Antibody, heavy 218, light 211 residues
Framework: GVQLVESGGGVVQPGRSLRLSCAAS????????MHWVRQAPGKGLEWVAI????????YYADSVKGRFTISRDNSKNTLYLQMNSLRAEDTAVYYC?????????????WGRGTMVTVSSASTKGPSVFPLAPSGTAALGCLVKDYFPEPVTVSWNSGALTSGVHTFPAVLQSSGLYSLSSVVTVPSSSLGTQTYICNVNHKPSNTKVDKKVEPKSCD | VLTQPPSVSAAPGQKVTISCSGS????????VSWYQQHPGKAPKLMIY???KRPSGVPDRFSGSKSGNSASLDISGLQSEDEADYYC???????????FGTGTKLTVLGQPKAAPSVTLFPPSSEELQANKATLVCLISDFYPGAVTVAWKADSSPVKAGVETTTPSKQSNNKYAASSYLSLTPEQWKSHKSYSCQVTHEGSTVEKTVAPT
């Protein structure tokens, strides 16, 4: 059957370039229109460019028109995408797809893309903050601006983990990952129970213990 | 352009239909296709050239075109079905392909439920850290699909926003978070900030101010 396996992506400080690589193995590549599609985390799919079977004409989306370049190399059934001046928004997953034979407007077989990550950062830590509480209120901790992905949380070293859920982080523009955790308790137990978050960020070799309190403010 | 709703949902064997609308510059003249992208795998050509299926696609997956909008119908839903879709077409004016806003077809396994917003205002600390981070907590909704966007006072804006994707939680429901990072002074000036969690037609706009 058809086969398309992207390759050549990862982490890259903004600006300098990087080239992706797709390889067909399931037909007569030499005669198939090629497609580049990307998908940021969450955001839908965004069409990028297209190249003919012989690599003559090609159409790019203003969304890049000029920042990128889509060359191919039929001798070694390999599809390429040159990315110069890597803007941050370009972080996403790059899908390589083959358009139909007599219907270039039809991407019949795609392959699990390959992840791109435009971020100029190198190991850093957490920046914990207190989400002052206010049927029965909820409160939490706001971890923010860390680079190395892995980061775990807990509250009071494991005392009844119920009523808690720690969201997934998010690659802000500064290419910095942030995430929060939240808890729910008897709004009747304010000023009687001590709530603190046992944060942890290995890549930074750090543990943090912010003790959240009720906002007697405003 | 090209809007499909963020949602649809139905029972473990019923019908459903997702829409697609753009303009005469696209869909109205150019052939439309539809793609099914499950969570982490790649997409799969479902319907092409308006109503066409690749031998490999059931007959229940159908699709029409009325004016400048196309629609993908589906009957006898199966857990299998539950995945995200996209209606795409070629736009004659921008000379470049176009994709859809996407739709998540969730096949009802549990009773619907409304999202539980809980907008947290900047922490006293961080503010000092010359920064303003607004947290909009969203939770406990069955059809894991919502829409998030903020509003500084009257007017809205996206300049400085970042929303996660839903994600199932212990209690079987989904739950995601938004973020509105600011400048402590931007926090000062604008006399009001609100988080909007539209979901299933019914929205929820929670607001909080400086004081």
């Amino acid at each position: 059957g058809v086969q398309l396996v992207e390759s050549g992506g990862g982490v890259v400080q903004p600006g300098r370039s990087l080239r992706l690589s797709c390889a067909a193995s399931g037909f007569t590549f030499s005669t198939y229109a090629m497609h580049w599609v990307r998908q940021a985390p969450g955001k839908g799919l965004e069409w990028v460019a297209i190249i003919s079977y012989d690599g003559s004409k090609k159409y790019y989306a203003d969304s890049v028109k000029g920042r990128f370049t889509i060359s191919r190399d039929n001798s070694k059934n390999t599809l390429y995408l040159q990315m110069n001046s890597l803007r941050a928004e370009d972080t996403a997953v790059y899908y390589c797809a083959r358009a139909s034979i007599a219907a270039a407007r039809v991407l019949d077989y795609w392959g699990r893309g390959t992840m791109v990550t435009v971020s100029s950062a190198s190991t850093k830590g957490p920046s914990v903050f207190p989400l002052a509480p206010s049927g029965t209120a909820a409160l939490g901790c706001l971890v923010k601006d860390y680079f190395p992905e892995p980061v775990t949380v807990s509250w009071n070293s494991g005392a009844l983990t119920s009523g808690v859920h720690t969201f997934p982080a998010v690659l802000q523009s500064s290419g910095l990952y942030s995430l929060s955790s939240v808890v729910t308790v008897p709004s009747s137990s304010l000023g009687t129970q001590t709530y603190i978050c046992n944060v942890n960020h290995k890549p930074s070799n750090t543990k943090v213990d912010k003790k959240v309190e009720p906002k007697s403010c405003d | 352009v090209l809007t499909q709703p963020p949602s649809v949902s139905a029972a473990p064997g019923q019908k459903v239909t997702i829409s697609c609308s753009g303009s005469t510059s696209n869909i109205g003249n150019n052939y439309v296709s539809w793609y099914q992208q499950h969570p982490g795998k790649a997409p799969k050509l479902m319907i092409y050239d308006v109503s066409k299926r690749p031998s490999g696609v059931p007959d229940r997956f159908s699709g029409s075109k009325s004016g400048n909008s196309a629609s993908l119908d589906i009957s006898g839903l199966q857990s299998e079905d539950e995945a995200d879709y996209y209606c795409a077409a070629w736009d004659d004016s921008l000379s470049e392909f176009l994709f859809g806003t996407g739709t998540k077809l969730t096949v009802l396994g549990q009773p619907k439920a409304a999202p539980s917003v809980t907008l947290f205002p900047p922490s006293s600390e961080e503010l000092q850290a010359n920064k303003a981070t607004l947290v909009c907590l969203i939770s406990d909704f069955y059809p894991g699909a919502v829409t998030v966007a903020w509003k500084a006072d009257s007017s809205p804006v996206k300049a400085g926003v970042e929303t996660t994707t839903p994600s199932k939680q212990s209690n079987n429901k989904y739950a995601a978070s938004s973020y509105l990072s600011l400048t402590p002074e931007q926090w000062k000036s604008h006399k009001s900030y609100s988080c909007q969690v539209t979901h299933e037609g019914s929205t929820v706009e929670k607001t909080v101010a400086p004081t």
